[PDB]
Amino acid sequence: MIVIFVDFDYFFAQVEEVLNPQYKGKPLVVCVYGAVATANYEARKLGVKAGMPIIKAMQIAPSAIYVPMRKPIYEAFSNRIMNLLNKHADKIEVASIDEAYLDVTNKVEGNFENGIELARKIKQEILEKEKITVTVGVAPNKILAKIIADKSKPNGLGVIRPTEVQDFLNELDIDEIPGIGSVLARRLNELGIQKLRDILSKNYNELEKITGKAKALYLLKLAQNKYSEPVENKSKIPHGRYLTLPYNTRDVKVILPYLKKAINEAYNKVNGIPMRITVIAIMEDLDILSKGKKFKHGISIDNAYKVAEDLLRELLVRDKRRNVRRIGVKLDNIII
DNA sequence: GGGAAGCC
DNA sequence: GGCTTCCC
């Protein structure tokens, strides 16, 4: 398997800089309501990092611009670029607006050197046609392609050939294993294991008592290099809309038209078929009821109306007391 | 099943 | 926020 993984570099801020060239070179930070969304690198070198209150941002980065978040344009860019990547790939799994996994194995016919050259070609094209720069990792499975991409930011072309895999898998701190953030890392680092391969010479059972059977297994077959969940033709990008009701009703014969309109425009922002539908509702006190059903086969818009109606009715059966103010729908797990 | 708690 | 695992 040859997996080329593409992650867009500080995306939002860069869509900005492309749109406003006079942002390029001076700190530019993007906001969500207020807190930091993305942030370019001239702004990074000053202590500006995602999720922090704009407060700290300004106090440590005063020469910085501060724009609001225009998501629709970013989604425009990510859409154009995903379509770029869809042409050089045999299979593509869209993980987010930011990132894609391409199985390009038949495209370079099993030849890793040709895969690397292809990644080069991809970068060149993305930057030529949309002035955007990406950080790429090339590897035999998804996880390593990613680990080497995150290790190759910014504007990088990371690389782990089959020859290198085992070696890499050795020298690899536990905290650099996606799915282990800060606390599990602290525990294992403080309870024995410092690096991935150290997991092998343990008792496994009392590793599950720290992580859970699943994630422990995953850590194994990764330490064993027995990992190869393949690249699926899917988008994990959520698509859905919320609509406010005239008053605070609690009656399906009023909500239904508003839910059916939420669905229609969620089912229109999506190319492909969803495997999950989630009905969401903001109650009187803004309390939110989330409730979704999964479908191994795709869900048609027509059957989506009925399934949603049932999800809703089931929600209102869960509440009985309060009424509904807003109505919402999310469509997930998308086959393409 | 599904609300609650903890970990990305 | 969303995914799991806990726990009723």
Domain count, chain A: 4
Does A122 reside within a domain? Answer: yes
Pick from A286, A242, A284, A289: which is nearest to A263 by CA?
Answer: A242
Which one-letter amino acid corresponds to residue A332? D
Same domain, A318 and A241: yes
**Strand B close residues, chain A 29-58, CB < 7 angstroms:** none
- The contacts of residue A63 (CB under 8 Å, 6+ apart) are A26, A27
CA of residue A10 relative to chain centroid, distance: 13
> A99 catalytic, yes or no?
yes
Does A231 reside within a domain? Answer: no
Same domain, A323 and A281: yes
CA of A3 to C1' of C7 (A): 41
Task: Please check if A332 is assigned to a binding site.
Answer: no
Tell me the structure's resolution in angstroms, rounded to a single decimal. 2.8
Per-residue tokens: A60: 């440590």
C-alpha–C-alpha distance, residues A202 and A218, integer Å: 15
C-alpha–C-alpha distance, residues A138 and A317, integer Å: 50
Q: What is the CATH number of the domain that holds A187?
A: 1.10.150.20
C-alpha–C-alpha distance, residues A105 and A277, integer Å: 33
Q: What is the CATH number of the domain that holds A142?
A: 3.30.70.270
Element (H, E) at A168: helix A165-170
Same domain, A24 and A154: no
Q: Helices A301-319 and A252-266: crossing angle, nearest 10°?
A: 140
The residue from A142, A159, A176 where one domain ends is A159
Does A153 reside within a domain? Answer: yes
Pick from A259, A266, A307, A304: which is nearest to A280 by CA?
Answer: A259
Task: Please check if A98 is assigned to a binding site.
Answer: yes
φ, ψ (nearest 5 deg) of residue A308: -65, -45
Same domain, A95 and A6: yes
Same domain, A166 and A266: no
HSE-CB at A322 with a 13 A cutoff on CA atoms is 15
CB A278 within 8 A of CB A330: yes
C-alpha–C-alpha distance, residues A308 and A328, integer Å: 10
CA of residue A128 relative to chain centroid, distance: 25
Q: Is A36 helix (H, G, I), strand (E, B) or coil?
A: strand
**Strand B close residues, chain A 149-178, CB < 7 angstroms:** 178
Q: Which residue has the tokens 């005063």?
A: A62
Q: What is the CATH number of the domain that holds A34?
A: 3.40.1170.60
CA distances A30 to A17, A74, A97, Å, are 11, 12, 16
C-alpha–C-alpha distance, residues A146 and A126, integer Å: 19
CA of A319 to C1' of B3 (A): 13
The nt closest to A317 (CA vs C1′) is B2
Identify how the structure was determined.
Answer: X-ray
The range of the structural domain enclosing residue A286 comes to 237-334
The answer, yes or no, to whether the previous bond of A238 is cis (omega within 30 of 0) is no
